[PDB]
């Protein structure tokens, strides 16, 4: 079994049943199994929103450097018109996410109870419930052939990497004051004079 | 202000008494050397006198027709006119420390009555038990009202009385 | 059972199925005891009927062009009117007649024990003389009353935010939907 | 078990089955205030009420005080908010204080009589329909029904954790408000300004340098 630090003693409540179970819990935050359920689902949610966030920060800036309505940085996305004020969009966002979020939470509380379309009562997700892993219309392209396990582990690894990447973007942008691909271009132009220690000591 | 008393910062006999005391101190001062020890002692006396008169005029004390600070002992009148720091806060400070002393003595008595030599602990003090009760007596008003509400504050009529009661 | 307020949830064991509007909605477990639940059924039906009449009144006042439900008692703070025709009274006499009439009607209603559905002279057309479609009409009645209660609280909150009537703010929402809602308001969401 | 001092002896009244299962028990009674179990019940109630209103108050200090250093919510200081609020208000402060004394007296007297008898406010007839939901939940200080809308108290395996999080955040918010008061008297600036001053120069801007807290230095 792969550990985060080979030779170290692993906690007994971490047993490989979760995707990406590497035994890393030095602060012992998940000794309670109920807290471990909540933390597994919260890890999935923070990880998937972080993956969409890092894609939404990379891909418009990766397309703005090459040959489309706006080439504006991600932290200046609020000061753009978007045919409407941001408050009305906040209201629409909170209504629709209240719907989706409360439906997902009712799946998590009672698994097997949020499956069928309430308006069109024949549309339904199958009985392979697995809270956090819906399936059905949420897997439309016919995946999960390779059984479920390796793709779950790829999902949690790309997600942890994107959570670290977004904590990146917040920190790098708060310190260097600039955009992240320009920070990568400065690290590729001269890495030996552009480290974190160089830019910290430049203050 | 209250009872026809002027404030001490406005009173003229207050300033006259301040000037008179400084005049007596400088008449005692002017018969010594400059940097000698009686001169330093009298200059420290004059410094404390000026500081004391400034502190009494600062605190909003009421002076009379003779220039002396008068105190107000009525809770509502002193809380209304800003004189609560002279009787009201001192009376609750005194009741705190006096009930402290009384409660520590009462707990020492009840602690030493349950032994084979209560009088011998009354003559020769059990110092660790006395210090333990002295530190524990800071919550004496709470413990006092709790002993009041349980009926254990009082002895019943098993007390000593005379034949006509 | 009329349905389920939240799918997957369970029906509370103190709500019977032979009762109109039983969606199983009791999170606070307020009507667990039967006398309380009887009083709340009475109160729910009465609040629903008064709210239907109040919402229909505010809609008729604003659609027929005589101000809104907020402009209507403004003459007494300053001459009454009805259908554009003056009514010769003042708030003291109106309060006297209203107090006498509501005291009499309310007292005759409260003399009865637990009567929610009187019939008789209150039902001249005899719809509930069959006891088969009567429960369906009771369910229609409790759903329309809940919708009217939600509508009237929406009227009050909507006027406390915007300062305008419901039909005028409905026209503002139909004109500029992304520029006239509870968020361009500046009150319902305190940021931005 | 866990104690406020590792090594000190736990008092005998806080080491009982009625006291060990309360919430946040660490054997901390050096004045012996909880030796009477009726007094310990009353002090449990007073601690819960001071915890909850201290958290609500300190949240009203901090979240408007943190967001006013951000963009929105131009909010005055908490030692100045009552004056600006009564300038903006519709009533004088005495009338508003009288209204809140009646409204708080009704609720507090309900809680008073529920302390004096646990099965008290569930009298039939005493309330129109709120009389059956104004009982306790078998543990006094922790009511149910309309209090706790989201039903989080129903789950039993999280319940000691919810209690202990409440008592720790509440004791910490009590220390926060007493620090707001003392910081207000010693410095004269807001608590977020005090935090910014301790972050700007920690080794020179603290309570050893304010000239108030220990004046022998
Ligand atoms: C959850 C992720 C998220 C993150 C990291 C940010 C981060 C930011 N947004 Mg925000 N936002 C986020 C969600 C959202 N924003 C907005 C709508 C806006 C607008 C319109 C603006 C921002 C702005 C900001 C900046 C706030 C700085 C400040 O001093 O605010 C304090 C000021 C207020 C809170 C007002 C910062 C770059 C500002 C900006 O981009 O300036 C550089 C800005 O003008 N955001 C919406 C639509 C409701 C969001 C959806 O959840
Ligand atoms: C914030 C989202 C989040 C959440 C809810 C979790 C939750 C979990 N992780 Mg994951 N993890 C995360 C982010 C997260 N992690 C990131 C970004 C990485 C890459 C560094 C990892 C790397 C990692 C490994 C290698 C392993 C876990 C494991 C776990 C599980 C047990 C550990 C625990 O009890 O801590 C609970 C975690 C929290 C309560 C979050 C604390 C957030 C702190 C306060 C933020 C502090 C600021 C931060 C340092 C910047 C639990 C399901 C173990 C597992 O079994 O995987 C399924 C395991 O082996 N994590
Ligand atoms: C990229 C990492 C990654 C990986 C390996 C997985 C893997 C999985 N997902 Mg997850 N998922 C992810 C990201 C990922 N997901 C993100 C970012 C979200 C939020 C939208 C989700 C939300 C989600 C839901 C709702 C469900 C899954 C399910 C699954 C499982 C089966 C579906 C599948 O095989 O798609 C494999 C994934 C890929 C091949 C990634 C494709 C990359 C796209 C095309 C790039 C998008 C464009 C980009 C932004 C530019 C499998 C474990 C399903 C399940 O578990 O059913 C039992 C399920 O119902 N996922
Ligand atoms: C030891 C006995 C004693 C005496 C003789 C006084 C005398 C006085 N009190 Mg004081 N007072 C006392 C103890 C006493 N006090 C105690 C123990 C308290 C705490 C409960 C107070 C709290 C208090 C307040 C809040 C006020 C007074 C006031 C007064 C003055 C007028 C009261 C009056 O007209 O009612 C007849 C006197 C009595 C019945 C004696 C008992 C006093 C009670 C406790 C308070 C009476 C207040 C009164 C109803 C308010 C009058 C308003 C004023 C503008 C006319 C008068 C000089 C008032 C004042 O400041 O006037 C300038 C005032 O507002 N007192
Ligand atoms: C106006 C008062 C009122 C009263 C007395 C009732 C009473 C009842 N309702 Mg009804 N209900 C109402 C309004 C009311 N309702 C409205 C307006 C709606 C639409 C939102 C509903 C939707 C509804 C459903 C779906 C169901 C019920 C049901 C019930 C019955 C059992 C629930 C219970 O025991 O709680 C007792 C109720 C109260 C004590 C209500 C008092 C109001 C509380 C104390 C404060 C509420 C303030 C409110 C949330 C403010 C909103 C502001 C907004 C900005 C968020 C009971 C007869 C269940 C039933 O079996 O039908 C008969 C059921 O399934 N109700
Ligand atoms: C009874 C249903 C109902 C309907 C059809 C409306 C309609 C409207 N409201 Mg009103 N409102 C309502 C209830 C309703 N409201 C309630 C219950 C409240 C108190 C919370 C309010 C408080 C309110 C404010 C403060 C404002 C409006 C405004 C508006 C207008 C703009 C759209 C909007 O932002 O809505 C408001 C959005 C919500 C209240 C959130 C949606 C939650 C609803 C109540 C759930 C039920 C809706 C249902 C699923 C679908 C509609 C049913 C209907 C067809 C019968 C629009 C005409 C705005 C305006 O004046 O525009 C110029 C405005 O500023 N409303
Ligand atoms: C005034 C609010 C208040 C109240 C009523 C209580 C009450 C209690 N505490 Mg709690 N506590 C508080 C604040 C309070 N505490 C704060 C702010 C902290 C963090 C420092 C704690 C940290 C704490 C620990 C670690 C423990 C307790 C425990 C207890 C229980 C037994 C102790 C006792 O009998 O003394 C009753 C206490 C009072 C009556 C408080 C007033 C005391 C005097 C009158 C004022 C003291 C002033 C103070 C020095 C501040 C200076 C200004 C009792 C329920 C023990 C327990 O077992 O809980 C279940 C326990 O182990 N408390
Ligand atoms: C609730 C916790 C708390 C926190 C985080 C702070 C933080 C601060 N205080 Mg305040 N203060 C507090 C409570 C607190 N205080 C209390 C209870 C009092 C009354 C005794 C004061 C009276 C006070 C004065 C007079 C002054 C400060 C000052 C300061 C600032 C400089 C550091 C310092 O010297 O503190 C002083 C530290 C104490 C008085 C002891 C702290 C008491 C706690 C309970 C000790 C336990 C802490 C805990 C183990 C770890 C911290 C918790 C944290 C992570 C949340 C700093 C922002 C100075 C300032 O304004 O700088 C600009 C300053 O002059 N404080
Ligand atoms: C159910 C339940 C249960 C669980 O258990 C819990 C909970 C959740 C809490 C609950 C809920 C509740 C709720 C939601 C409530 C609401 C209510 C309402 C809204 C009412 C109104 C109600 C309302 C109403 C009646 C109203 C009425 C009205 C009226 C008459 C009006 C009148 C008028 C008019 C014509 C116009 C003019 O110009 C003026 C006036 C005079 C103004
Ligand atoms: C335990 C014990 C035992 C042993 O035996 C002995 C000893 C040690 C003695 C003891 C201890 C004790 C202690 C420490 C106590 C403390 C307490 C506290 C601090 C409280 C607070 C408490 C606190 C509190 C309530 C508070 C609250 C607050 C609030 C509401 C606030 C409010 C406000 C706001 C929002 C803002 C505005 O603008 C104004 C105001 C109005 C201001």
Topology:
The structure is cut from a larger assembly and holds chains A (203 residues), B (165 residues), C (192 residues) and D (217 residues).
Chain A: H1 33-64, H2 86-109, H3 149-176, H4 180-189, H5 196-201
Chain B: E1 6-7, H1 12-29, H2 37-58, E2 62-63, E3 69-70, H3 75-81, H4 88-112, H5 118-123, H6 127-136, H7 140-150
Antiparallel strand pairs in B: 1-2, 2-3
Helix pairs in contact in B: 1-2, 4-6
Chain C: H1 34-63, H2 74-77, E1 80-82, E2 85-87, H3 91-111, H4 134-162, H5 166-175
Antiparallel strand pairs in C: 1-2
Helix pairs in contact in C: 1-4
PDB class: photosynthesis
Keywords: photosystem membrane protein, photosynthesis
Entry title: Structure of the green algal photosystem I supercomplex with light-harvesting complex I
Question: Which structural traits does this protein have?
Answer:
part of a larger assembly; 4 chains; A: 203 residues; mainly alpha; 49% helix; D: 217 residues; Chlorophyll a-b binding protein; binds the ligand CC1=C[C@H](O)CC(C)(C)[C@H]1/C=C/C(C)=C/C=C/C(C)=C/C=C/C=C(C)/C=C/C=C(C)/C=C/C1=C(C)C[C@H](O)CC1(C)C; photosynthesis
What does this structure look like?
The structure is cut from a larger assembly and holds chains A (203 residues), B (165 residues), C (192 residues) and D (217 residues). Chain A has five helices and no strands. Chain A has helices at 33-64, 86-109, 149-176, 180-189, 196-201. In chain A, helix 1 (33-64) packs across helix 3 (149-176). Chain B is mainly alpha-helical and 165 residues long. Chain B has a single domain (1-165), classed as Helicase, Ruva Protein, domain 3. Chain B has helices at residues 12-29, 37-58, 75-81, 88-112, 118-123, 127-136, 140-150, and strands at residues 6-7, 62-63, 69-70. In chain B, strand 2 (62-63) and strand 3 form a beta hairpin. In chain B, helix 1 packs antiparallel against helix 2. Chain B is elongated and about 70 Å long. In chain B, 8% of the residues are buried. Chain C is mainly alpha-helical and 192 residues long. Chain C is 49% helix and 3% strand. Chain C is built from five helices and two strands; from the N terminus they run H-H-E-E-H-H-H. Chain C has helices at residues 34-63, 74-77, 91-111, 134-162, 166-175; strands at 80-82, 85-87. In chain C, helix 1 packs across helix 4 (134-162). The radius of gyration of chain C is 21 Å and the shape is globular. With 217 residues, chain D is mostly helical. Chain D has helices spanning 17-20, 37-67, 81-88, 93-116, 159-186, 191-200. In chain D, helix 2 crosses helix 5. The two termini of chain D are 40 Å apart. Classes of the chains: A mainly alpha (203), B mainly alpha (165), C mainly alpha (192), D mainly alpha (217). Chains in contact: A-C, B-D, C-D. The structure holds chlorophyll B, chlorophyll A (CLA) (7 copies) and the ligand CC1=C[C@H](O)CC(C)(C)[C@H]1/C=C/C(C)=C/C=C/C(C)=C/C=C/C=C(C)/C=C/C=C(C)/C=C/C1=C(C)C[C@H](O)CC1(C)C (2 copies). Residues 74-77, 80 of chain B line the site of one chlorophyll A (CLA). One chlorophyll A binds next to helix 1 and helix 3 of chain A.
């Amino acid at each position: 079994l792969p550990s985060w630090m080979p030779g170290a003693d692993l906690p007994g409540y971490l047993n490989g049943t979760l995707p990406g179970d590497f035994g890393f819990d030095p602060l012992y935050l998940g000794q309670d199994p109920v807290k471990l359920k909540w933390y597994a689902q919260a890890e999935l949610m923070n990880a998937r929103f972080a993956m969409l966030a890092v894609a939404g920060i990379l891909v418009p800036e990766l397309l703005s450097n090459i040959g489309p309505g706006a080439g504006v940085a991600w932290y200046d996305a609020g000061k753009f018109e978007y045919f409407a004020p941001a408050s009305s969009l906040f209201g629409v966002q909170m209504l629709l996410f209240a719907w989706v979020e409360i439906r997902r939470y009712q799946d998590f509380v009672k698994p097997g109870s949020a499956n069928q379309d309430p308006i069109f009562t024949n549309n339904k997700l199958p009985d392979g419930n697995e809270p956090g892993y819906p399936g059905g219309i949420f897997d439309p392209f016919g995946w999960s052939k390779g059984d479920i396990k390796s793709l779950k582990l790829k999902e949690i690894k790309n997600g942890r990497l994107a959570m670290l990447a977004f904590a990146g973007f917040i920190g790098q942008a708060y310190t260097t004051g600039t955009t992240p691909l320009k920070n990568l271009s400065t690290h590729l132009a001269d890495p030996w004079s552009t480290t974190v220690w160089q830019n910290d000591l430049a203050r | 202000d209250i009872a026809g008393l002027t404030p001490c910062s406005e009173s003229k006999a207050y300033a006259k008494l301040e000037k008179k005391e400084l005049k007596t101190l400088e008449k005692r001062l002017k018969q010594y050397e400059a940097d000698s020890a009686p001169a330093v002692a009298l200059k420290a006396t004059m410094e404390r006198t000026k500081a004391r008169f400034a502190n009494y005029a600062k605190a909003g004390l009421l002076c009379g027709n003779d220039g002396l600070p008068h105190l107000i002992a009525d809770p509502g009148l002193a809380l209304k006119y800003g004189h609560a720091g002279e009787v009201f806060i001192p009376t609750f400070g005194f009741l705190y420390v006096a009930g402290y002393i009384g409660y520590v003595g009462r707990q020492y008595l009840i602690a030493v009555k349950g032994e084979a030599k209560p009088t011998d602990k009354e003559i020769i003090i059990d110092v660790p038990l006395a210090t333990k009760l002295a530190w524990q007596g800071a919550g004496w008003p709470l413990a006092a009202v709790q002993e009041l509400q349980r009926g254990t504050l009082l002895e019943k009529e098993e007390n000593i009385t005379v034949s006509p009661r | 059972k009329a349905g389920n307020w939240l799918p997957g949830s369970d029906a509370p064991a103190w709500l019977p199925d032979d009762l109109p509007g039983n969606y199983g909605f009791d999170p606070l477990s307020l009507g667990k005891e039967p006398a309380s639940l009887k009083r709340f059924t009475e109160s729910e039906v009465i609040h629903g009927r008064w709210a239907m009449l109040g919402v229909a009144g505010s809609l008729a006042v604003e659609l027929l062009g005589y101000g809104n439900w907020y402009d209507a008692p403004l003459w007494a703070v300053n001459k009454a009117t009805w259908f554009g025709i003056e009514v010769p009274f003042d708030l003291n006499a109106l309060l006297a007649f209203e107090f006498v009439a509501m005291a009499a009607a309310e007292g005759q209603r409260g003399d009865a024990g637990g009567v929610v559905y009187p019939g008789g002279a209150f039902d001249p057309l005899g719809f509930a003389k069959d006891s088969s479609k009567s429960g369906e009409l009771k369910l229609k009645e409790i759903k329309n009353g809940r919708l009217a209660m939600v509508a009237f609280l929406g009227f009050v909150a909507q006027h406390a935010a915007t300062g305008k009537g419901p039909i005028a703010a409905l026209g503002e929402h139909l004109a500029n939907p992304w520029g006239a809602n509870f968020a361009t308001n500046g009150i319902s969401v305190p940021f931005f | 078990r866990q104690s406020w001092l590792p090594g000190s002896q736990i008092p005998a009244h806080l080491d009982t089955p009625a006291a060990q299962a309360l919430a946040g028990n660490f054997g901390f009674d050096p004045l012996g205030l909880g030796k009477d179990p009726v007094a310990l019940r009353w002090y449990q109630q007073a601690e819960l009420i001071h915890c909850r209103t201290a958290m609500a108050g300190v949240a009203g200090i901090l979240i408007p005080g943190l967001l006013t250093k951000a963009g929105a919510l131009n909010v005055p200081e908490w030692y100045d908010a009552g004056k600006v609020a009564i300038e903006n208000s519709f009533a004088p402060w005495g009338s508003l204080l009288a209204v809140q004394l009646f409204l708080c007296g009704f609720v507090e007297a309900k809680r008073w009589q529920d302390i004096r008898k646990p099965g008290s406010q569930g009298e039939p007839g005493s309330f129109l329909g709120f009389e059956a939901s104004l009982k306790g939940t078998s543990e006094l200080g922790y009511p149910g029904g309309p209090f706790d809308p989201l039903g989080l108290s129903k789950e039993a395996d999280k319940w000691a954790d919810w209690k202990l999080k409440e008592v720790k955040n509440g004791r910490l918010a009590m220390l926060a408000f007493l620090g707001f008061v003392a910081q207000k008297y010693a410095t004269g600036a807001g608590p977020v300004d005090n935090l910014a001053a301790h972050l700007k120069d920690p080794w020179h801007v603290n309570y050893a340098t304010n000239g108030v807290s220990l004046p022998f230095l």
